[PDB]
Coordinates of N, CA and C and ligand atoms in Angstrom, one line a residue:
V1 N 1.1 -1.0 -0.1 CA 0.0 0.1 0.0 C 1.1 1.1 -0.1
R2 N 2.4 1.0 0.6 CA 2.9 2.2 0.5 C 3.9 2.3 -1.2
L3 N 3.5 2.6 -2.4 CA 4.2 3.6 -2.9 C 5.5 2.9 -3.6
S4 N 6.2 4.2 -2.1 CA 7.7 3.4 -2.0 C 8.0 1.5 -1.8
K5 N 7.6 1.1 -0.7 CA 8.2 -0.4 -0.5 C 7.6 -1.0 -2.0
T6 N 6.9 -0.2 -3.1 CA 5.9 -1.9 -2.6 C 7.5 -1.1 -4.5
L7 N 7.8 0.0 -5.0 CA 9.3 -0.2 -5.9 C 9.8 -1.2 -5.4
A8 N 10.4 -0.4 -3.9 CA 11.6 -1.2 -4.1 C 11.3 -2.6 -3.9
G9 N 10.5 -3.4 -4.1 CA 10.2 -4.5 -4.2 C 10.9 -4.5 -5.8
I10 N 9.4 -4.2 -6.9 CA 9.9 -4.5 -7.9 C 11.3 -3.9 -8.9
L11 N 12.2 -3.4 -8.1 CA 13.0 -2.9 -8.4 C 14.5 -3.6 -8.2
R12 N 14.5 -5.1 -7.2 CA 14.8 -5.7 -6.6 C 14.8 -6.6 -6.5
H13 N 13.1 -7.6 -6.0 CA 13.1 -8.9 -6.1 C 12.3 -9.6 -7.9
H14 N 10.9 -8.2 -7.6 CA 10.2 -8.6 -8.9 C 9.6 -7.9 -10.1
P15 N 10.3 -7.3 -10.9 CA 10.2 -7.0 -12.2 C 9.5 -7.2 -12.7
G16 N 9.3 -8.4 -13.5 CA 8.2 -9.0 -14.4 C 6.4 -9.6 -14.1
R17 N 7.0 -8.9 -12.8 CA 5.5 -9.6 -11.9 C 5.2 -8.3 -12.3
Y18 N 5.4 -7.1 -12.7 CA 4.8 -5.4 -12.8 C 4.6 -5.0 -13.9
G19 N 5.5 -6.3 -14.8 CA 5.8 -6.0 -16.7 C 7.0 -5.0 -17.0
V20 N 7.6 -4.6 -16.0 CA 9.4 -4.3 -15.4 C 10.5 -5.2 -15.9
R21 N 11.3 -4.9 -17.2 CA 12.3 -5.1 -18.0 C 13.5 -4.6 -17.5
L22 N 14.1 -5.1 -16.7 CA 15.8 -5.0 -16.0 C 16.5 -5.2 -16.6
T23 N 17.2 -3.9 -16.9 CA 18.7 -4.3 -17.4 C 20.3 -5.1 -17.0
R24 N 21.7 -5.0 -16.9 CA 22.5 -6.0 -15.5 C 22.7 -4.7 -15.6
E25 N 22.5 -3.8 -15.4 CA 22.5 -2.7 -14.1 C 22.5 -2.5 -13.4
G26 N 20.5 -3.2 -13.7 CA 19.7 -2.9 -13.1 C 18.5 -1.6 -13.0
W27 N 18.8 -1.3 -14.6 CA 17.9 -0.2 -14.9 C 16.6 -0.3 -15.4
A28 N 15.9 0.6 -14.7 CA 14.0 0.4 -15.5 C 13.7 1.4 -16.5
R29 N 12.8 1.2 -17.3 CA 11.5 2.5 -16.8 C 10.8 3.6 -16.6
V30 N 11.2 4.1 -16.1 CA 10.1 4.4 -15.4 C 8.6 4.6 -15.4
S31 N 8.4 5.7 -17.2 CA 7.0 4.7 -17.5 C 6.8 3.6 -17.2
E32 N 6.9 2.6 -18.0 CA 6.5 1.2 -18.2 C 7.2 0.7 -16.8
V33 N 7.5 1.3 -15.3 CA 6.9 1.2 -13.7 C 5.6 2.4 -13.8
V34 N 5.3 2.7 -13.3 CA 4.2 3.5 -13.3 C 3.2 2.2 -14.4
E35 N 3.0 2.8 -15.5 CA 1.9 1.5 -16.4 C 2.2 -0.2 -15.2
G36 N 3.2 0.0 -15.7 CA 3.1 -1.3 -14.3 C 2.2 -1.5 -12.7
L37 N 3.1 -0.3 -12.9 CA 1.6 -0.1 -11.5 C 0.3 0.4 -11.4
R38 N -0.3 1.4 -12.9 CA -1.2 1.0 -13.3 C -2.6 -0.6 -12.8
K39 N -1.7 -0.8 -14.1 CA -2.1 -2.9 -14.1 C -2.3 -3.2 -12.9
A40 N -1.8 -3.1 -12.1 CA -1.9 -3.5 -11.1 C -2.8 -2.6 -9.5
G41 N -3.7 -1.9 -10.1 CA -4.4 -1.1 -9.6 C -4.5 0.2 -8.9
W42 N -2.4 0.7 -9.3 CA -2.6 1.5 -9.2 C -2.8 2.8 -10.2
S43 N -4.1 3.1 -10.1 CA -4.5 4.3 -11.1 C -3.4 5.4 -11.0
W44 N -4.0 6.0 -9.3 CA -3.1 7.8 -9.3 C -1.7 7.5 -9.9
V45 N -1.5 6.3 -9.6 CA 1.2 6.9 -9.5 C 0.5 7.6 -11.4
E46 N 1.5 8.5 -10.8 CA 2.5 8.8 -12.0 C 3.8 9.6 -11.8
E47 N 4.7 9.4 -13.6 CA 6.1 10.1 -12.7 C 6.9 10.3 -11.8
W48 N 5.8 11.2 -12.3 CA 6.0 12.1 -11.1 C 5.9 12.0 -9.6
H49 N 5.8 11.3 -9.2 CA 5.5 10.2 -8.4 C 6.9 9.6 -7.2
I50 N 7.1 9.1 -8.7 CA 8.4 7.6 -8.9 C 9.4 8.5 -9.3
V51 N 9.6 9.7 -9.2 CA 11.1 10.9 -9.6 C 11.1 11.6 -7.6
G52 N 9.5 12.1 -7.5 CA 9.6 12.2 -6.4 C 10.1 11.2 -5.0
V53 N 9.6 10.6 -5.3 CA 9.5 8.9 -4.7 C 11.7 8.9 -4.6
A54 N 12.0 9.3 -5.9 CA 13.2 8.6 -5.6 C 14.5 9.6 -4.7
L55 N 13.8 11.1 -5.1 CA 14.4 12.5 -4.8 C 14.6 12.8 -3.4
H56 N 13.7 12.1 -3.2 CA 12.8 11.6 -1.3 C 13.3 11.4 -0.6
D57 N 13.7 9.8 -1.1 CA 13.4 9.3 0.2 C 15.8 9.2 0.5
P58 N 15.2 9.0 1.5 CA 16.8 9.3 2.1 C 17.6 8.3 2.7
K59 N 17.7 7.2 2.7 CA 18.7 5.8 2.5 C 19.1 6.2 1.1
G60 N 18.6 6.7 -0.1 CA 18.9 7.0 -1.2 C 18.8 6.6 -1.8
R61 N 17.9 5.6 -1.7 CA 18.0 3.7 -1.7 C 17.6 3.5 -3.7
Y62 N 17.5 5.5 -4.3 CA 17.7 5.0 -5.8 C 18.3 5.8 -6.2
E63 N 18.1 5.3 -7.8 CA 18.8 6.2 -9.3 C 18.3 6.9 -10.3
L64 N 18.4 8.1 -10.8 CA 17.8 8.9 -11.8 C 18.8 8.8 -12.7
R65 N 18.3 8.7 -13.9 CA 19.1 8.5 -14.9 C 17.3 9.8 -16.0
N66 N 17.9 10.5 -17.3 CA 17.5 10.1 -18.4 C 16.2 9.1 -18.6
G67 N 14.8 9.4 -17.6 CA 13.4 8.9 -17.7 C 14.1 7.3 -17.2
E68 N 15.1 7.2 -16.1 CA 14.9 6.0 -15.8 C 15.1 6.2 -14.2
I69 N 15.4 4.7 -14.0 CA 15.1 4.0 -13.2 C 15.8 2.6 -11.8
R70 N 16.6 2.9 -11.4 CA 16.5 1.2 -10.3 C 17.7 1.2 -9.0
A71 N 17.4 0.5 -8.0 CA 17.5 -0.2 -6.7 C 19.1 0.1 -7.1
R72 N 19.8 0.8 -6.0 CA 21.1 1.4 -5.5 C 21.7 0.0 -5.2
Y73 N 21.2 -0.8 -3.8 CA 21.3 -2.5 -3.7 C 20.4 -3.1 -3.3
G74 N 20.4 -3.9 -2.1 CA 19.0 -4.8 -1.3 C 18.6 -5.4 -2.9
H75 N 19.5 -5.9 -3.9 CA 19.1 -6.7 -5.6 C 18.7 -8.1 -4.2
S76 N 18.2 -9.1 -5.0 CA 17.6 -10.5 -4.7 C 18.2 -10.5 -6.3
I77 N 18.2 -10.3 -6.8 CA 18.0 -10.5 -8.3 C 19.6 -10.0 -9.1
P78 N 19.9 -10.5 -10.3 CA 21.8 -11.1 -10.4 C 21.5 -9.6 -10.8
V79 N 23.1 -8.6 -9.7 CA 22.8 -6.9 -11.9 C 24.0 -6.1 -10.3
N80 N 24.4 -5.7 -11.2 CA 25.5 -5.2 -11.9 C 25.3 -3.1 -11.4
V81 N 25.0 -3.0 -10.8 CA 26.1 -1.8 -9.9 C 26.6 -0.8 -9.6
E82 N 27.9 -0.3 -9.5 CA 28.8 1.0 -9.4 C 28.3 1.5 -8.0
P83 N 29.5 1.5 -7.2 CA 29.3 1.9 -5.8 C 30.0 3.1 -6.6
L84 N 30.3 4.1 -4.7 CA 30.8 5.7 -4.7 C 31.9 6.4 -3.9
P85 N 31.8 7.3 -4.4 CA 33.6 6.9 -4.2 C 33.3 7.1 -2.5
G86 N 34.5 7.1 -1.7 CA 34.6 7.0 0.1 C 34.9 5.4 0.3
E87 N 36.1 5.4 1.2 CA 36.2 4.6 2.3 C 36.1 3.9 2.8
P88 N 34.9 3.7 3.7 CA 33.5 3.5 4.7 C 34.5 3.5 5.8
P89 N 33.8 3.6 6.8 CA 34.2 3.2 8.3 C 34.6 3.1 8.5
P90 N 35.8 2.6 9.8 CA 36.1 1.3 11.0 C 35.4 0.6 10.9
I91 N 33.7 1.1 12.1 CA 33.2 0.5 12.2 C 31.9 0.4 11.6
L92 N 30.9 -0.2 10.7 CA 29.3 0.0 10.5 C 28.6 -0.9 10.8
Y93 N 28.4 -1.3 10.6 CA 26.3 -1.8 11.6 C 25.7 -2.3 10.6
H94 N 25.1 -3.4 11.7 CA 24.4 -3.9 10.6 C 22.9 -5.1 11.7
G95 N 21.8 -4.6 11.3 CA 21.0 -4.2 12.8 C 20.4 -6.3 12.4
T96 N 19.4 -7.4 12.8 CA 18.9 -8.7 13.6 C 18.9 -9.4 14.4
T97 N 18.5 -10.2 14.3 CA 17.7 -10.5 15.4 C 17.8 -10.8 16.6
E98 N 17.9 -11.4 17.7 CA 18.3 -11.8 18.8 C 18.6 -13.3 18.5
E99 N 17.3 -13.5 17.6 CA 17.4 -15.2 17.5 C 18.6 -15.5 17.0
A100 N 19.6 -14.5 15.8 CA 20.2 -14.8 15.2 C 21.2 -14.2 15.5
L101 N 21.5 -14.6 16.7 CA 22.8 -14.4 17.0 C 23.3 -15.4 17.3
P102 N 22.6 -16.6 17.9 CA 23.9 -18.0 19.0 C 24.0 -18.4 17.4
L103 N 23.4 -18.4 16.2 CA 23.9 -19.0 14.4 C 25.4 -18.0 14.3
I104 N 25.1 -16.2 14.6 CA 25.6 -15.2 13.6 C 26.7 -15.8 14.4
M105 N 27.0 -16.0 15.9 CA 28.0 -16.2 16.4 C 29.4 -17.0 15.8
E106 N 28.7 -18.5 15.7 CA 29.3 -19.8 14.6 C 30.1 -18.6 13.8
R107 N 29.1 -18.9 13.0 CA 28.9 -18.9 10.9 C 29.0 -17.3 11.3
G108 N 28.5 -16.0 11.4 CA 28.6 -15.1 11.4 C 27.4 -14.0 10.2
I109 N 27.9 -13.5 9.8 CA 26.6 -13.2 8.9 C 26.9 -13.8 8.0
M110 N 25.4 -14.6 7.3 CA 25.0 -15.4 6.0 C 24.4 -13.8 5.0
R111 N 24.8 -13.9 3.8 CA 24.0 -13.4 2.4 C 22.6 -13.3 2.6
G112 N 21.1 -14.8 3.0 CA 20.2 -14.4 2.9 C 19.7 -14.0 1.4
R113 N 18.1 -13.4 2.2 CA 18.0 -13.4 0.2 C 18.4 -12.6 -0.9
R114 N 19.4 -11.9 -0.1 CA 20.2 -10.6 -1.4 C 21.0 -11.2 -1.6
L115 N 21.9 -10.3 -2.8 CA 23.2 -11.4 -3.3 C 24.5 -10.8 -2.5
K116 N 24.0 -10.0 -2.0 CA 25.4 -9.1 -0.3 C 24.8 -8.6 0.8
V117 N 25.7 -8.7 1.6 CA 25.6 -8.4 3.0 C 25.7 -7.1 2.8
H118 N 24.9 -6.7 3.6 CA 25.3 -4.6 3.9 C 24.9 -4.2 5.5
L119 N 25.8 -3.3 5.2 CA 26.1 -3.0 7.0 C 26.2 -1.7 6.7
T120 N 24.9 -1.3 7.7 CA 25.7 0.8 7.3 C 25.7 1.4 8.3
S121 N 26.2 2.7 8.2 CA 26.5 3.6 8.7 C 26.2 4.3 10.4
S122 N 24.5 4.1 9.4 CA 23.6 5.0 10.9 C 23.1 3.7 11.8
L123 N 23.8 3.7 13.0 CA 22.9 2.8 14.5 C 21.7 3.7 13.8
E124 N 20.7 4.4 13.8 CA 19.6 4.3 13.6 C 18.9 3.5 13.6
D125 N 19.1 3.5 10.8 CA 18.5 1.9 10.2 C 18.9 1.1 10.8
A126 N 20.1 0.4 11.7 CA 20.7 -0.7 11.6 C 19.0 -1.2 12.7
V127 N 18.4 -0.1 13.8 CA 17.5 -0.8 13.8 C 16.2 -0.6 14.1
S128 N 15.8 0.2 12.7 CA 14.7 -0.1 11.9 C 14.8 -1.3 11.0
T129 N 15.8 -2.0 10.3 CA 16.4 -2.3 9.5 C 16.1 -4.0 11.0
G130 N 16.8 -4.1 11.6 CA 16.2 -5.3 12.6 C 14.7 -5.5 13.3
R131 N 15.0 -3.7 13.7 CA 13.0 -4.5 13.5 C 11.7 -4.5 13.0
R132 N 11.9 -5.1 11.7 CA 11.1 -5.1 10.2 C 10.6 -7.1 10.1
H133 N 11.8 -6.9 10.4 CA 12.0 -8.6 11.0 C 12.3 -10.1 11.8
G134 N 11.4 -9.6 12.9 CA 11.4 -10.7 14.0 C 11.3 -9.5 15.2
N135 N 11.1 -9.7 16.0 CA 11.2 -7.4 17.4 C 12.7 -8.8 17.9
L136 N 13.2 -7.3 18.9 CA 13.7 -8.2 19.4 C 15.5 -8.1 19.1
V137 N 15.6 -6.7 18.5 CA 17.0 -6.9 17.4 C 17.7 -6.7 18.4
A138 N 19.0 -7.2 17.6 CA 19.8 -7.3 18.6 C 21.2 -6.9 16.3
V139 N 21.5 -5.7 16.9 CA 22.2 -5.2 15.8 C 24.2 -5.1 16.0
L140 N 24.8 -5.8 15.5 CA 26.2 -5.6 15.9 C 26.9 -4.9 14.9
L141 N 28.4 -4.9 15.4 CA 28.9 -3.8 14.9 C 30.5 -4.4 14.4
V142 N 30.3 -4.3 13.0 CA 31.3 -4.5 12.1 C 32.7 -4.3 11.9
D143 N 34.0 -4.7 12.2 CA 34.7 -4.3 12.6 C 35.4 -4.4 10.4
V144 N 35.1 -3.0 10.0 CA 35.5 -3.0 8.4 C 36.6 -3.9 8.5
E145 N 38.6 -3.0 8.5 CA 39.7 -3.5 8.1 C 39.7 -4.4 9.0
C146 N 39.2 -5.4 9.9 CA 38.7 -7.1 9.8 C 38.9 -7.7 8.5
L147 N 37.4 -6.8 7.8 CA 36.9 -7.6 6.8 C 38.0 -7.7 5.7
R148 N 38.7 -5.7 5.6 CA 39.3 -5.9 4.4 C 41.1 -6.4 4.4
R149 N 41.5 -7.5 5.4 CA 42.5 -8.4 5.8 C 41.3 -9.9 5.4
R150 N 40.5 -9.8 5.7 CA 39.8 -11.5 5.6 C 40.7 -11.0 4.0
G151 N 39.9 -10.1 4.0 CA 40.5 -9.7 2.3 C 39.5 -9.6 1.5
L152 N 38.0 -9.4 2.7 CA 36.3 -8.9 1.1 C 36.4 -8.0 1.0
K153 N 35.8 -7.5 0.1 CA 36.1 -6.4 -0.7 C 34.8 -5.8 0.0
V154 N 34.6 -4.2 0.6 CA 33.5 -3.6 1.4 C 33.3 -2.3 0.0
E155 N 32.4 -2.5 -1.0 CA 31.5 -1.8 -1.9 C 30.0 -0.5 -0.9
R156 N 31.1 0.6 -1.3 CA 29.2 1.7 -1.2 C 29.2 1.8 -2.3
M157 N 27.5 1.9 -1.7 CA 26.1 1.4 -3.0 C 25.8 3.4 -2.4
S158 N 26.1 3.9 -1.1 CA 24.4 4.7 -1.0 C 25.9 6.0 0.4
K159 N 25.3 6.4 0.4 CA 25.9 7.7 1.0 C 25.9 6.4 3.3
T160 N 24.7 5.7 3.2 CA 25.1 5.1 4.2 C 25.2 3.7 4.3
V161 N 25.0 3.1 2.9 CA 24.7 2.1 2.7 C 25.7 1.0 2.0
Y162 N 26.3 0.1 2.5 CA 27.6 -0.7 2.3 C 27.5 -2.5 2.9
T163 N 28.3 -2.5 1.2 CA 28.6 -4.9 1.5 C 29.0 -5.0 1.3
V164 N 29.3 -6.3 1.2 CA 30.4 -7.4 1.7 C 30.0 -8.9 0.9
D165 N 30.6 -9.8 0.5 CA 30.0 -10.9 0.7 C 29.4 -11.4 2.0
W166 N 30.3 -12.0 2.5 CA 29.4 -12.4 4.6 C 30.6 -11.7 5.2
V167 N 30.0 -11.6 6.9 CA 31.2 -10.7 8.0 C 31.3 -11.9 8.5
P168 N 32.6 -12.5 8.7 CA 32.8 -13.7 9.5 C 33.0 -13.2 10.9
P169 N 32.6 -14.1 12.1 CA 32.6 -13.8 13.1 C 33.6 -13.0 13.5
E170 N 34.3 -13.4 13.5 CA 35.9 -12.9 14.2 C 36.0 -10.8 14.5
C171 N 35.1 -11.2 12.8 CA 35.1 -9.3 12.3 C 34.1 -8.5 13.3
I172 N 33.1 -9.2 14.3 CA 32.2 -8.4 14.6 C 32.7 -8.0 16.2
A173 N 33.0 -7.1 16.2 CA 33.9 -6.0 17.4 C 32.5 -5.2 18.6
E174 N 31.5 -5.9 17.8 CA 29.9 -5.4 19.5 C 28.6 -6.2 19.5
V175 N 27.9 -6.6 20.0 CA 26.2 -7.1 20.4 C 26.1 -6.3 20.9
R176 N 24.7 -6.2 20.5 CA 24.3 -5.3 21.7 C 22.8 -5.7 21.2
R177 N 22.4 -5.9 23.0 CA 20.8 -6.3 22.8 C 19.5 -5.8 23.0
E178 N 19.6 -4.9 22.2 CA 17.9 -4.3 22.7 C 17.1 -4.3 23.5
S179 N 17.0 -5.7 24.5 CA 16.6 -5.8 25.7 C 17.6 -5.5 26.6
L180 N 18.8 -5.6 26.7 CA 19.4 -6.0 27.7 C 19.1 -3.8 28.3
Ligands
CL201 CL1 9.4 -11.3 -10.8
CL202 CL1 13.7 -6.4 1.2
CL203 CL1 16.7 -0.8 3.2
CL204 CL1 21.0 -7.5 4.0
CL205 CL1 30.3 11.6 2.4
ZN206 ZN1 8.7 16.2 -4.4

């Protein structure tokens, strides 16, 4: 029912479901997205909403170019999006469920349905993120350098969002249980 939430699903997980075709670079035509949303019963949707959604997103979730749009990260579909300039901070956060900690302590942070593992520089974001699946959020502090030495590359997809294949258990510097 939320336009943005729905848009991110279309550009990250199910284009065709809405008749939208994406390139390897992840791009899509705004018009094609608009029609697709209309055919899905969103009658009032117009191209300007889509631009508004993209230009006002706080996380910098989307990108635009000559009548096109794509998500910058969070894809569960194979796609290639180039990173943004800027070395990562020494520590990056990642939210999740306390219930996931037992496993994570052993295995570390695993991929999930998304292609790569996402890490945020914003503590607040990590919380709301954890709060999205299951409750009793547990935010983990990830030592980036530790990752780089593990050889795992850390790429910047948006001002506050970065990704890596996985986070080794040993690169977790702190676990904070919201229940404590
Ligand atoms: Cl699909
Ligand atoms: Cl998602
Ligand atoms: Cl998100
Ligand atoms: Cl993730
Ligand atoms: Cl910056
Ligand atoms: Zn606006």
